[PDB]
Design a protein around this ligand. Structure first.
Ligand code: NAG
Ligand code: NAG
Ligand code: NAG
Ligand code: NAG
Ligand code: NAG
Lengths: 1000, 365
């Protein structure tokens, strides 16, 4: 139904020319009647635009080029506006006609055994191919297509990357006119070449003095299937080829206290990839004490006796407990000084001991709940963990009995040893064939080994190392917390059934002696008499049951600052891959706030949580911020990198928000004032442009411009309807004019706020506007370019140009005080911010944003935009551009579509020195001749230009004259009758039209 | 002679090792001071620093002075010992308070005795700057500043004048008492804020005799245990100095005159005569180092760089401790960069700090 769409667009066009017959003020002041039908009237010039809209689309002509008239020069603005509105209504109907056929038909990918081809089955009665990474749509630069839409990609794609393809169909020149197809089913590119992405270091830490753990995941662009990895470890070299699926390595046999540097790379079939680096220390070595200098103690546990041994060279010997039955498992505690006991049939007997003797006797503890078989002690959360026989199931109770909590699923094999790591939040146990893992709530179940019949194991909580004996093989062996690291160690040969470590020594029990070997002849030997069998040695050091972890540094410090207050938030030190979710996460914090100018600091210790507020700070002062973590025992951690943060200057700074529902609240620089205002706007409003203190203008998200009067809602708005297809709005305080980008008419409309008299101004394709009030330069930004419009045509200065595939201009702001001009470019996956002077282009930062949301913050000297989610606002200061403050949106207006820092001073009134005075009608006189009038001059001395209309007979002639004399030519004969109209103008306004009738 | 054999004799009669501490050397310097251990540290650091570029080490005779009424007889015994019992005698360094106390005996003996510069110049601006930045409130108070001698009162109101502070005694209930001495603030029965600045070393008797909630403004004594904690340069701490503490103001105030005198001795061995068997006529006219051609003012980082103690200046702090019954660390001013760290302890477990207006903003004149 083309001919119906064409005739309906032409009929709606001539109806819009009929109804707008007296709405727009003309630059010559025409004022035709409703039935004049002359050349100068609005109806004939607008109907000339509606008679040439389909001619311009067929012959690929612009609306300015189709509406060229010699009488109205250089821009016949009702003709151009009617042409652009008819073409925009036609392309809106042509996107509503083929909406379902574009959004239903999915293109298919085809490669033949040769570039990659799209096949789109599209039969229509500019286009863009867009690609997406499969882990934002980016346009394709190079393609070769035809009339059957068989489009071949000849651009170099990244290899071994999954891609989706879309067709963007721009129907009109408007950017809301695009139609997108459904995306293709995905295509992996074939592999070639070296890997081009480095691996990512997740954690790089030191386990003890001789081991060093690294964890990695692959990069984004592997350029092939991953076969292997290469690790090069160097001091401030060892090279190991780790296979494809593994994401951890622990480097053995290293020296202590040494800075190490590690390099990761990816090896496919073709070659090696790039190098990622990281710096790490091993640890400080423990001072290994000799055999004479041992003040520490052990506990030797047999089947029927528990015997305490001191490790002096003349060591004291004492029985703690002698049993009539056979003990199966026992517990120990360092800070409670409590020892638990268990038997063959289940009888829990707790016993407190101090310095190797009785303090409290053996009291029997019935378990309020399964017969108990093994036992371990949680020293942080103060629980007792029991592995019972009914199948076998690990539960946890309390020290008094009761509060039984079942941990994990049941299992078939018996538990021969149960050890609980409280500090890293783990439970370790062994079966007949295996060694395992759980956390304290039983979530992460992992099996560490599958070895035939292991022996005793000892778990080091700081060092993340499980030493394990295999007594039938005579083998002493070393396991990590995930089972990937199996280091065999040489055992001192005799079989031993138990062990302990004091540093790097080995405390092995025989039936006659305990020997401390760092052969069978030891460094030291302690005699045994009363214990024929010994299956356990428990060393009585607080490193066996620790409260505190090693290290701990906070990260991601950030701070939002006001004038006299701050809100500082950091995160908690991260958890190791050998640390579960049930680990020790109890830290205190210490925050050092350094005054830079005064060279003073104040440090707040015992900060319990990861957020701290500060208040009564000094305004406009630079502060440096670093934080560190303090653990339970109270030794400090490491400081962060210092964050330089500057407070706002002094003054009540109101920030005006607007919710997407339409509620306007006023906060302060942090978002803490929260004064809800009584006005309610429409859905998705933009920023408010005030004319006076009461009446303001705002643009909603669908393109409608609204006027609201805040104090009395009946009057104050000269327009009655909301006005369609408006992009931005600004105000001149000096001339008293409201400027908006008419997106349908492709123009800028200048309107008096008192009378509603609109004026079409020849600024074309503008999306956002600003006016410099000192001289009247109209700064505008297209999505492609950013320019300037002035009074003379020599003042047109273009500051930036975008190609279009790179992106578009998101907003701009004008800094008239320091002669600066900032803008935001929304791009392909990036948000860039720039700067240029008004009279050197400088990129400030590259980081998306709401359009027309970039506001200049003249107290802080910062720039503020609002993100597209509406829940976060970004501040970039000009003094420190690398630090971006993230201001949270308050919860009353929590999806936000507008943010505006309010002016503390009121708006200045209408300056009467930019109004042109009218020409007196008696002074317009006749001297090829000249026409002279009295020169119109404003209140302040400004350059007043004039515009001429020479309507003689039926022919008319228009002139744009800066001079008060009119060089008049081109009369056909003598005795003509001239109708002469003078309209004076400044750069801010226009004067009234003085119409005379003089005869020559 | 008898004075070379018996040594210095102090009246029972006391032996020489009770109050004289000696590092050996070819040239002998004499230090007569209350804190000899800082002097032994300064002569040890210029021995391992080798500013002289000579083979011979600098010797010290560090006389310990506990009462000031017996220093005249030991000055007579030291001018007899350093006239008779040595080969080369540079001079006798006396600290500034015993120089100003006993200037008639030094002028009457006419021997080469020079003052160590005073440590109160290194201490009293730190006192006025820790009092300048102190979190106080919005209350002005009545101050009463009690010193032992009037010279500490003149230099303390001078140091309060360069920190832009006025300290006036109004008639008001809020009282601030600053006591300058080791015996003035001993069980003070008056009520108010008590600041106590000790002059000498702080004993357990002084921390016992202070009231509760009383402020102790003192410097940190730095214990010497090993030689690797002083600098990255491998040196050797002498075996007498291990296990003993130095005061940093005595170290810097002696060490400026030691850097000036060994720079003069560089000029003297450059013009004269490095091996001391070949070298001759060390000391001919030695009073010219007090003249301004060889006397210079050095910054404290230059003193730690020249004498190889750059890792020591992190522990060179001036603290303010409150006695709560424990000495809680409240303030800390580093000597090498004058940065002032106050310590606040979130108690009551809050989540914000209302920042009090400081003591220099209240007392600003
Ligand atoms: C370890 O070395 C890195 C550079 O490799 C250095 O920046 C880091 O501070 C070093 N750790 C030390 C010695 O503090
Ligand atoms: C603002 O201007 C409008 C006309 O544009 C008028 O009705 C209104 O009264 C003015 N308000 C104030 C507070 O001046
Ligand atoms: C120091 O010397 C004086 C000399 O009169 C003597 O009375 C006094 O006991 C000595 N000791 C002290 C601690 O003042
Ligand atoms: C610290 O202060 C002293 C005077 O008390 C001065 O000589 C020195 O230069 C200052 N040091 C700095 C600013 O690093
Ligand atoms: C603050 O926390 C400490 C440590 O838990 C506690 O002793 C103290 O009572 C708490 N103070 C309160 C809640 O006022």
């Amino acid at each position: 139904d083309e001919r119906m769409v064409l005739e309906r667009v032409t009929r709606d066009c001539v109806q819009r020319c009929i109804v707008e017959e007296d709405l727009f003020l003309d630059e010559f002041g025409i004022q035709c009647e409703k039935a004049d039908n002359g050349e100068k009237c609005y109806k004939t010039r607008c109907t000339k635009g509606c008679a040439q809209w389909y001619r311009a689309l067929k012959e690929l002509e612009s609306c300015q080029e189709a509406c060229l008239s010699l009488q109205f020069y250089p821009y016949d603005m009702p003709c151009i506006g009617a042409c652009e509105m008819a073409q925009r209504d036609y392309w809106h109907l042509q996107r509503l006609a083929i909406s379902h056929l574009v959004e239903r038909t999915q293109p298919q990918l085809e490669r033949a055994p040769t570039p990659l081809t799209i096949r789109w089955a599209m039969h229509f009665p500019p286009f863009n191919i867009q690609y997406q990474f499969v882990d934002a749509w980016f346009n394709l630069a190079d393609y070769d297509c035809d009339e059957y839409y068989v489009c071949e990609i000849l651009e170099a794609l990244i290899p071994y990357t999954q891609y989706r393809f879309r067709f963007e169909l721009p129907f009109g020149e408007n950017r809301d006119e695009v139609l997108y197809s459904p995306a293709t089913p995905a295509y992996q590119t074939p592999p070639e070449g070296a890997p081009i992405s480095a691996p990512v270091i997740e954690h790089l830490m030191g386990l003890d003095d001789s081991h060093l753990a690294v964890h990695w995941h692959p990069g984004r662009f592997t350029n092939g299937p991953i076969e292997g990895y290469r690790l090069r470890l160097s001091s401030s070299t060892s090279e190991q080829l780790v296979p494809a699926g593994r994401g951890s390595y622990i480097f053995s046999q290293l020296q202590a206290g040494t800075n190490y540097t590690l390099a990761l790379s990816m090896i496919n079939k073709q070659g090696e990839g790039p190098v990622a680096k990281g710096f790490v220390q091993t640890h400080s070595a423990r001072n290994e004490k000799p055999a004479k200098d041992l003040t520490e103690s052990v506990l030797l546990v047999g089947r029927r006796a528990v015997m305490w041994q001191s490790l002096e060279p003349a060591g004291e010997n004492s029985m703690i407990y002698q049993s009539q039955e056979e003990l199966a498992d026992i517990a120990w505690s360092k800070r409670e000084q409590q020892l638990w006991l268990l038997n063959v049939h289940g009888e829990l007997r707790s016993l407190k001991f101090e310095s190797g003797q009785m303090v409290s006797p053996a009291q029997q503890l019935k378990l309020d709940l399964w017969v108990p078989r093994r036992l371990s002690f949680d020293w942080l959360h103060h629980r007792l963990y029991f592995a019972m026989e009914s199948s076998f199931q690990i539960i946890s109770t309390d020290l008094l009995g009761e509060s039984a909590q079942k941990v994990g699923e049941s299992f078939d094999l018996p538990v021969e040893q149960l050890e609980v790591d409280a500090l890293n939040g783990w439970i370790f146990w062994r079966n007949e064939e295996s060694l395992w893992r759980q956390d304290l709530h039983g979530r992460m179940i992992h099996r560490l080994l599958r070895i035939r019949q292991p022996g005793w194991f000892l778990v080091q909580p700081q060092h993340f190392i499980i030493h394990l004996m295999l007594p039938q093989e005579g083998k002493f062996l070393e396991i990590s917390y995930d089972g990937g690291f199996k280091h065999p160690l040489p055992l001192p040969p005799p079989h031993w059934q138990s062990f302990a470590l004091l540093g790097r020594s080995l405390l092995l029990p025989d039936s006659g002696q305990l020997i401390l070997v760092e052969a069978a002849s030891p460094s030291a030997s302690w005699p045994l008499k009363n214990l024929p069998d010994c299956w356990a040695v428990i060393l009585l050091v607080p490193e066996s049951q620790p409260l505190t972890s090693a290290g701990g540094k906070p990260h991601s410090l950030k701070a939002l600052l006001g004038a006299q207050a701050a809100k500082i938030s950091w995160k908690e030190p991260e958890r190791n891959p050998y640390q579960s979710a049930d680990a020790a996460r109890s830290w205190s914090y210490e925050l050092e706030v350094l005054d830079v100018a005064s060279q003073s600091a104040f440090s707040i210790r015992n900060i319990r949580g990861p957020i701290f507020g500060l208040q009564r700070l000094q305004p406009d002062n630079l502060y440096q911020l670093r934080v560190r973590a303090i653990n339970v025992d109270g030794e400090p951690g490491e400081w962060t990198e210092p964050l330089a943060a500057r407070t706002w200057p002094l003054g009540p700074h109101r920030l005006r928000w607007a919710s997407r529902q339409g509620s306007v609240i006023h906060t302060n620089e942090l978002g803490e004032g929260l004064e809800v205002q009584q006005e309610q706007l429409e859905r998705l409003p933009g920023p408010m442009t005030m004319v006076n203190e009461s009446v303001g203008y705002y643009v909603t998200g669908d393109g409608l411009l609204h006027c609201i009067n805040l104090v009395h809602s009946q009057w104050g708005c000269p327009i009655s309807e909301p006005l369609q297809h408006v992009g931005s709005v600004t105000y001149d305080w000096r001339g008293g004019r409201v400027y908006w980008t008419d997106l349908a008419r492709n123009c800028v409309v200048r309107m008096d706020p008192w009378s509603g008299s609109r004026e079409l101004l020849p600024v074309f394709e503008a999306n956002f506007l600003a006016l410099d009030p000192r001289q009247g330069h109209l700064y505008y930004a297209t999505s492609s370019q950013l320019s300037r419009h002035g009074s003379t045509p020599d003042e047109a200065v273009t500051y930036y140009r975008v190609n279009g595939l790179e992106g578009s201009i998101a907003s701009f702001v004008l800094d008239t005080q320091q002669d600066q001009l900032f803008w935001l470019v929304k791009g392909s996956g990036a948000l860039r911010l720039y700067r240029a002077p008004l009279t050197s282009l400088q990129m400030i930062q590259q980081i998306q944003a709401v359009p027309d949301s970039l506001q200049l913050l003249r107290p802080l000297g910062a720039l503020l935009w609002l993100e597209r989610s509406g829940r976060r606002a970004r501040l970039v200061r000009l003094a420190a551009p690398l630090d971006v403050m993230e201001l949270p949106t308050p919860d009353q207006a929590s999806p936000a579509s507008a943010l505006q820092l309010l002016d503390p001073q009121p708006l200045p009134p209408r300056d009467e020195g930019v109004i042109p005075m009218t020409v007196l009608p008696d002074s317009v006189r006749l001297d090829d001749f000249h026409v002279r009038w009295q020169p119109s001059t404003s209140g302040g001395n400004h350059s007043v230009s004039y515009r001429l209309l020479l309507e003689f007979g039926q022919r008319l002639q228009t002139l744009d004259l800066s001079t008060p004399f009119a060089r008049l030519t081109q009369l056909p004969q003598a005795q003509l009758q001239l109708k002469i109209s003078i309209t004076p103008r400044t750069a801010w306004r226009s004067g009234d039209t003085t119409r005379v009738q003089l005869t020559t | 002679p008898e004075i070379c054999l018996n040594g210095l004799q102090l009246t029972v009669i006391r032996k020489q090792e009770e109050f004289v501490k000696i590092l050996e050397g070819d040239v002998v310097l004499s230090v007569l001071t209350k804190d000899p251990d800082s002097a032994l540290f300064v002569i040890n650091r210029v021995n391992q620093a080798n500013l002289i570029m000579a083979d011979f080490e600098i010797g010290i005779r560090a006389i310990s002075i506990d009462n000031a009424s017996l220093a005249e007889n030991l000055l007579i015994q030291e001018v007899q010992f350093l006239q008779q019992c040595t080969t080369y005698s540079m001079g006798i360094f006396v600290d500034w308070e015993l120089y100003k106390q006993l200037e008639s005996v030094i002028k009457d003996l006419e021997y080469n005795i020079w003052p160590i510069p005073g440590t109160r110049a290194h201490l009293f601006p730190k006192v006025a700057h820790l009092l300048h930045q102190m979190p106080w409130g919005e209350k002005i108070a009545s101050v009463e500043i009690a010193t032992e001698t009037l010279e500490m009162y003149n230099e303390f109101m001078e140091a309060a004048r360069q920190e832009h502070m006025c300290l006036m005694h109004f008639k008001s209930d809020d009282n601030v008492y600053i006591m300058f001495g080791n015996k003035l603030a001993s069980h003070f029965k008056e009520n108010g804020t008590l600041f106590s600045v000790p002059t000498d070393r702080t004993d357990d008797e002084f921390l016992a005799d202070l009231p509760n909630r009383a402020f102790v403004l003192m410097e940190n004594e730095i214990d010497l245990s090993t030689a690797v904690e002083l600098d990255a340069t491998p040196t050797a701490l002498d075996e007498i100095l291990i296990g003993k503490s130095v005061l940093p103001s005595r170290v810097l105030s002696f060490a400026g005159s030691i850097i000036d005198l060994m720079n003069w001795l560089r000029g003297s061995l450059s013009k004269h005569c490095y091996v001391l068997e070949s070298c001759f006529n060390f000391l001919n006219f030695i009073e010219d180092w007090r003249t301004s051609e060889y006397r210079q003012a050095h910054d404290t980082a230059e003193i730690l760089s020249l004498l190889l103690m750059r890792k020591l200046g992190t522990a060179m702090n001036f603290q303010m401790y409150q006695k709560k019954v424990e000495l809680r660390e409240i303030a800390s001013q580093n000597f090498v960069t004058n940065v002032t760290t106050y310590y606040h302890y979130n108690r009551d477990n809050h989540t914000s700090l209302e920042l009090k207006t400081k003591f220099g903003q209240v007392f600003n004149c």
